[model samples]
Target: PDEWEVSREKITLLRELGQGSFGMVYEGNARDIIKGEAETRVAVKTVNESASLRERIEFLNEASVMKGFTCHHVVRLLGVVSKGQPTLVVMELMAHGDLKSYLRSLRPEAENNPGRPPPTLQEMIQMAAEIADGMAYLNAKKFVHRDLAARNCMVAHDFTVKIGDFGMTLPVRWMAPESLKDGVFTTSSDMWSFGVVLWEITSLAEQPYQGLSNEQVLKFVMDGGYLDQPDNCPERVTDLMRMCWQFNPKMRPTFLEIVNLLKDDLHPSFPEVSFFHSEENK
Candidate 1:
């Protein structure tokens, strides 16, 4: 039971950060018993005592995935505390919190502030690029996020985006058409969700399919209906989103391609055109 386990004695719970469908997440501080009390801030996600068996399984699955991963843009797992009533997953605390809430807070008439300025094009593009970089790493590791969206991503104080909320059931609006119809998931399906995420970032976190029900969304997607470009969305970025929303999974670009496109658009002079080809030559 010591394999990948952390001592609960090392963690001191601070306060509740938020709650999700499976459990509550709390902000905490961890002391390293093996390292002379070196301390670090962390987020602790605890499974609800009443959680279904499947929910518990998925919770552990997320911890497993995070432990196996090492990427700058992916949320990092500190350790797991399993010897308790409710299992605890300790992870890096994202100071700025979820991207969706951050974006909504930028609205001019937002609840807390009435005159906040929305993120600029450069900021939005950088956030999108960071997410693509994370997804690309997951793709290379043969991991399909299955649930990729703005609400599922965390942002650091410096505006870095880290993909989070894996191993959870996503809303129908964020799901790919293929995933909805055939119950199949792949990197391409993740790409589809990435497109919706881009839509959210560009539109300042507008809900996807504002007027449509889940059933209606499924039919709309099956009939080839796609989201329109957000107001002030750059044409190049809009094109990339359209490509990601391709009905046929094969037509969707890989996360690597999406990353390259974003990088190229963000820095035309130092384009990534040669990076992929260099790999082939090597």
Candidate 2:
């Protein structure tokens, strides 16, 4: 394990937050919780000790991305706690949790459901607006979030949406085979993922190609079989989804344009938060 300093050893793991390919997340608090006036809450992401070199590299990259990100719509990384055999990535805990479960909990008058009512058109607009804001900040920083999806977004108790889960993301993947023989990632590939995320939010949590194997989904995407909104979905929302998944990444709208198109429908009081402390640093 990597050498790192932690404040205390009495952290209490509360509940399972979620799981991913390489690790699982849990809600926890460090020993010195009441160090100051601010109550400290932490998310502990434990990585697999047997991870491959590439996977480790990706994790490190994700850590760097987290350090670079500072927008109000993005969750912050508090620090790393690697004193144990498996490294734990300690980050600020999002109270409400990810959007995937949030969407799934929405049912047609399901009794005792805690999630908000099935998202209305206006809610969709706000969610989309927040995503665009976070994406714009990332783009400005010259980094791409390649695995953006509704599942990666986290919500607060107050209904504020923030982007999270950077480990699964790749930077880019649009270059010719020769240029990327070493398998370097690319920015345009991220745009593709972003489109998928938008589709999830607009489609009311319908999964993409459910029951299909990874190979099948890859084939579908490679053959241009992009997602199509259900017949009942709004036309404007479908149109936006189409724009996000345009085959040619260069033809896709930048996050800036996305914000511009969605601005009118978004709440005016939504605050602007920068991902970087300043342009010079990133």
Candidate 3:
């Protein structure tokens, strides 16, 4: 379909953003992506010539899955260039980079500037809610983001987060019990990964089970041991994390339920503390 194909002539590659398992990501200008548009800043994903055939095929399959996504919390697929030699997937640029690095950076900034506090509770909560809504949308469309975590998510300049970087990302600490045991990745498993994401957000991007090896996490999780409640996080949020990590996949909260839980637990009403109450679920 032409919906996600771009004319190679209009894409001007610039500086590299970061290197990936397949190749490199570059920040570039994609012209004519929109009607009469001069140009737009976009993320250009390249395929390495040396990658195994299966890896390269996986990259394209990811793009195929993400086509026609309009959900604000899921990164947009502007277009792709692959008719000829070089293959590139053009996507909307996430200016602030991945959520893991963004959250990790927060601590240093907070320490450097003693005048202000770390990001507010509402902000972090909303970030979780946004992720839930995004996941919910994908669930509706019959997709399982087998890999979900702060590192796999992206942050926009406006501080809004979007699910992205679906290059078969990994880190077993985020997997559900069934996923570890049999490679099962259903919607329930995705929610389990979402719980790990919530932990990452509340813990300032601390790696889960930091003291344990990957093997240890597998054993620990299989035996039903869960990560301790993150300090400074609200009781309700921690409870939700526990729900997502339930030993039984069927016991997990659906993504839609998670959204209701977040918004229903209303924070101190408006003026007491200013925050944008943006709702895009319609």
Candidate 4:
């Protein structure tokens, strides 16, 4: 166990937030008995006891990988409870939930009040920039988030976007052509997924390749096809997306380059109002 390991007794599992192929995620509270600290609410990912050995390894790996991350736009890991039957990995709870669900909730069909204002174009651009910032950090650390999508990101109460759901599963729709064909994962491949994520945010969570099968989507991408500019997507943003979707990964912009592009021209004042407050202090 690492220094960040917390006793199972410290965590009080509350309610189920959601479930995925690997396991269920729960809302929980963790207390520091040693320091008499107030309980902190967190998201806990618990692996199913019946899970396969490979699944268990992946679950452990996710915890191991997340332990090294400290960026504001990336979900923060609190600690882990590994001394029991069901291993629990605790993280800071995102109040608004995943970006995909949040976007859906803003839609007429899901909103309780029909007149709720939708996200502004500027807000969407900021969200994309934030994701790019997080990816830049991850790339700097030599990590590739094989799964980057709206569904894999969380939104905070203050409208900040943070990438999450780092798992072993590979959803082909958001994957690069090289990843899909050669089982390769790299920073460039992650840029490709970032393009799909931008499409999701701009389209208000529209499913990528609406009616196309995975195989068809694969063929389409291999044949130099990419998602058309989402309805009302800014031309500048669309240009970045096209750059990310380049058939040759080497031709795609690095996350740092994407960050500069988003800041330099799209939002000239963004550098002054850095995405993360801590970043400014740094």
**Cα deviation in Å at residue 164, candidate 3?**
0.5
Q: 2 in model 4: Cα distance from truth in Å? A: 4.3
Q: Report the poorest 10 consecutive residues by lDDT, candidate 2.
A: 170-179
lDDT of 2 by residue, 128-216 (tens): 77776777776666766656777788887667787884425421222212112344345555556666666777655676767766556
Instruction: Give the TM-scores of the predictions, in the order they appear.
Output: 0.85, 0.76, 0.86, 0.85
Runs off by more than 4 Å, candidate 4: 33-37, 52-58, 111-115, 165-170, 264-282
Candidate 3: Cα lDDT at 223? 85
Q: What is candidate 1's local distance difference test score?
A: 0.79
From the highest lDDT down, the ranking of the candidates is 4, 3, 1, 2
In model 1, where do residues sit more than 4 Å from their true spots? Answer: 1-4, 33-37, 52-58, 114-116, 264-282
Q: Write the per-residue lDDT of candidate 4 for residues 66-169, one digit (tens) a residue.
A: 88877777888888877756788888888788999888778767745236666886787788888888887777676788888898899877778888844344
Which portions of model 3 miss their true places by more than 4 Å? Answer: 52-58, 109-117, 165-170, 264-282
Per-residue error for 165 in candidate 4, Å, reads: 4.7
Spell out the clash pairs found in candidate 4. none
Instruction: Give candidate 2 misplaced runs (Cα > 4 Å).
Output: 1-6, 30-36, 48-65, 83-87, 109-112, 167-185, 210-220, 274-282
The C-alpha lDDT values of all candidates are: 0.79, 0.65, 0.80, 0.80
Better of 1 and 3 by TM-score: 3
